Amino acid sequence: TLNGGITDMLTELANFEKNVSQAIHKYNAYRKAASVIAKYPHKIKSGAEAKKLPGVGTKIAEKIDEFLATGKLRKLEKIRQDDTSSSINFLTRVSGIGPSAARKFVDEGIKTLEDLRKNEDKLNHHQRIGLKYFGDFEKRIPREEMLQMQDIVLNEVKKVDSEYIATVCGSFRRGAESSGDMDVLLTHPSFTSESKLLHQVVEQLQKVHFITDTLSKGETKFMGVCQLPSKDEKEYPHRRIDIRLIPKDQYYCGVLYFTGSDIFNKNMKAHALEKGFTINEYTIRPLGVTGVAGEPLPVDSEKDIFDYIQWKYREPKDRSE
DNA sequence: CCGACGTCGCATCAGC
DNA sequence: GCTGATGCGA
DNA sequence: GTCGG
Ligand SMILES: Nc1ccn([C@H]2C[C@H](O)[C@@H](COP(=O)(O)C(F)(F)P(=O)(O)OP(=O)(O)O)O2)c(=O)n1
Ligand SMILES: [Mg+2]
After folding, report:
1. C-beta of A258 in contact with ligand 1 (< 6 A)
2. Is the minimum distance from the CB of A171 to ligand 1 under 6 angstroms?
3. The domain A140-257 is classified under which CATH number: 3.30.360.10, 3.20.20.80, 3.40.640.10, 3.30.460.10?
4. For the domain bounded by A83-139, which CATH number is listed?
5. Of A205, A213, A209, A31, which Cα lies nearest the Cα of A136?
6. Which superfamily, per CATH, for A258-320?
7. Is A94 annotated as a binding residue?
8. Which of A26, A39, A63, A75 is catalytic?
């Protein structure tokens, strides 16, 4: 809303930095600028006005001015029309093709999906799956399908061993009406910090033809593809699903962290610091009088975490910030 | 001025 | 063959 | 690219 022309511009600049110039920190700077401007509840009229916001500096101020006085950025217009740069940027939309792989492909004349299709031999396993489901991976998932997906996942996990605890986290857990993928956090009492749990779950999901492809799989993280059964109806798009096995004594921290939002974890993180706490994905530890965290504390639900920091439970419904 | 800017699991590469 | 580095996505 | 030490 409000400054979509500006934030589209900035996001576009961000992508070229990451994908073409391989400048991760500029990618991040542009996205911060785009994010702070997106939340600005006013129609921006000058670069100076924008510069007042944290993350918007002299150069972005200048870019805004040019956009506001012409309706575009010369550099961006040039970048878009550059065959090499535009191709490198495009190829990274394929899961598994990052900035480096895109650059190599474009160097050797491989620039479109058709070219990718023509050169399967030059693609690793992940990249082939990314190519296979290029279109599907870019679709969002309606909440109703996410629930249908949740039904299958919770049912099959409990079927393998009823002592598993499984939680669908991510935007879905925050009640969002659509998701980009499904994230499943999994634990089991026989698995602690101190102490084939994941393989067995993946195998069951494959057995009932829910999981269709594997991108990567180790003892704690699975990254793959799944698909709901089809009704005389259109088949469902294939969807990205992740499954993480976490020790029970870190599980609820993990659930918090992987539920988001990113901005919420930000805000909640600093609060821990104020009251002398370093919360990371895994644990919560107290900062001694020097900057020295001690042991991780007991955590046996999300709330235990809120309590250590004298917060009251925020239902995931409102963890947008 | 100049460095920081977030982190990790898995797949694959580079070097030995 | 092994160990550490790099690429990648989240 | 922007920030801050
Ligand atoms: N650079 C990154 C990016 C992400 N993540 C982790 C940390 C996040 O908890 C997790 C998902 O971030 P997400 O990018 O899918 C999102 F924020 F858009 P979400 O709202 O969760 O969308 P959805 O629920 O539909 O998948 O990836 C990370 O660790 N590093
Ligand atoms: Mg996601």
Report:
1. yes
2. yes
3. 3.30.460.10
4. 1.10.150.20
5. A213
6. DNA polymerase, thumb domain (3.30.210.10)
7. yes
8. A63
